[PDB]
Each structure stands twice: as C-alpha cells, then as structure tokens.
C-alpha cells in the first residue's frame, strides 16, 4: 500500500464531520467535497477519472462507502500533476499592467470568474482579503503564497 493503514483512523474520524447521517455511505458529491476539503486539491477531471464516472450526469445519485475513499486518495497521491509556485506566479504576472504586480482586485476576480473553471463571485468574495480604497491594489506574492500553502 502507498499509505500507512494505521493513519486510516484519522480519515475515518474526519469523515464523520459533515452534516449528514454518516451511516457508512456518502454520495459522489460528498466524496468530492471531502476530497476538496481534507485531501489534496483535486480537479473535476481527476474526480471523474480516478474511480469516477464520466458518463455520470447527476452526482446526487451515485453513492460510495467509507473504505472506498482510501484507494482514491492513494491513487491521487501518485497520479496527480500539481505545478510549482513559479508557474502560478508567471500566470498571474501575465495579467500585470504596471510590472510590479499590484493590479486592482477586479482583475483577479474577473480572471477567477471568467477564465478557467469560472468560479462563483460569492466564493471569491471571501478569499479576496484585499483593501478597497483609492488605489485598491493587491499583491500576488503574499496572496498566491497563502492560497497555495494548503
């Protein structure tokens, strides 16, 4: 096994934290939420491929047990392809206009809501901890570092 079985107790205890019945079964959406929260930041493609179901169109129908979650994590911990911080730094600087990397927060919100997986504005409103004033500039260094810290 690619993971110590003794540590499975922590995962089993953490699975019993959501506002659900917790009777040894969790829906596909619940599995994805647990993987996004506890497990390493996954992606829709990884969730649909790694023991997933591309043909599935309603995640609220399929259901899995607790033991079925450890193989998913063990496989994602070897098949994942997470990039370094330099890639994200360059991607954020590509949208820079002054060169110093202090563009207003509107640019980050637009890039997160439109380009890519188009996130919801209500979700990014909680992460954007910038200051709103005459300048309203936000730095990419500390922000991206705290975002990728995990």
């Amino acid at each position: 096994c690619d993971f110590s079985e003794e540590q499975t107790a922590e995962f089993k205890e953490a699975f019993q934290l959501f506002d659900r019945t917790g009777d040894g079964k969790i829906l596909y959406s619940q599995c994805g939420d647990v993987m996004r929260a506890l497990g390493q930041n996954p992606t829709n493609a990884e969730v649909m491929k790694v023991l997933g179901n591309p043909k599935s169109d309603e995640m609220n129908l399929k259901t899995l047990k607790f033991e079925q979650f450890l193989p998913m994590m063990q496989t994602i911990a070897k098949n994942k392809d997470q990039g370094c911080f330099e890639d994200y730094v360059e991607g954020l600087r590509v949208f820079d206009k002054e060169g110093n990397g202090t563009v207003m927060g509107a640019e980050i919100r637009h890039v997160l809501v439109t380009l890519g997986e188009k996130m919801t504005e209500e979700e990014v409103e909680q992460l954007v901890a910038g200051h709103e004033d005459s300048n309203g500039c936000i730095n990419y260094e500390e922000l991206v570092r705290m975002v990728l810290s995990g």
Binding site: D87, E90, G91, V94
Partner: protein, 98 residues
C-alpha cells in the same frame, strides 16, 4: 467599380507581401518574455543572451526552417506562424489558471 477600387488601392499587392514575406516580427527579449511557457525545459535558469535563448526555443518548438528567419535584433515569422503560437500559449496559460 469594385475591381478598379481594389487594384488602385493595392489590396492585392498588400496581401501578396503578407504571404511571401514575414509580416510578424518579435524582438528577441520580447519573444522570450512571452513564449517561455511553451518550452520551459529549454533554457538554463541562469542569465543568457536574448538571441541565444530564442534559438533554443525555436528548435524545441519543432518549427520548420522556412517558417522563420532569425535577424539581428528581431525574430521574423511568416503569416500564420505567430498566430498559431498565440493559440498554444492560451492553452498553456489556461491550464495554469485551472
């Protein structure tokens, strides 16, 4: 009327040079600062001349010799070559955003 307006205006002559010639022109330094995500594992981390760096990126991109011509201070490209690199750059930046 439409034919005489296009011949005198030089629309045809303006497109011929665009195909036979190299309409796109990117500076050595500007070409590296904008097309580095396409071939990241092709230039050492240390400093290097802008001309020597572009020579490695073009070779790694598997571009035909007839689709480019390195000059003295600007890299030339034929019609449709630089446009293709922009599309590939978007896919790379899109993956970085994802």
């Amino acid at each position: 009327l439409v034919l005489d307006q296009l011949r005198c205006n030089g629309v045809l002559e303006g497109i011929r040079i665009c195909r036979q010639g190299f309409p796109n022109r990117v500076v050595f330094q500007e070409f590296r600062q904008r097309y580095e995500i396409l071939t990241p594992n092709s230039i050492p981390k240390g400093f290097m001349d802008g001309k020597q760096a572009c020579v490695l990126m073009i070779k790694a991109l598997e571009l035909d010799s007839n689709l480019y011509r390195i000059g003295q201070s600007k890299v030339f490209f034929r019609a449709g070559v630089l446009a293709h690199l922009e599309e590939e750059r978007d896919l790379k930046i899109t993956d970085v955003i994802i």
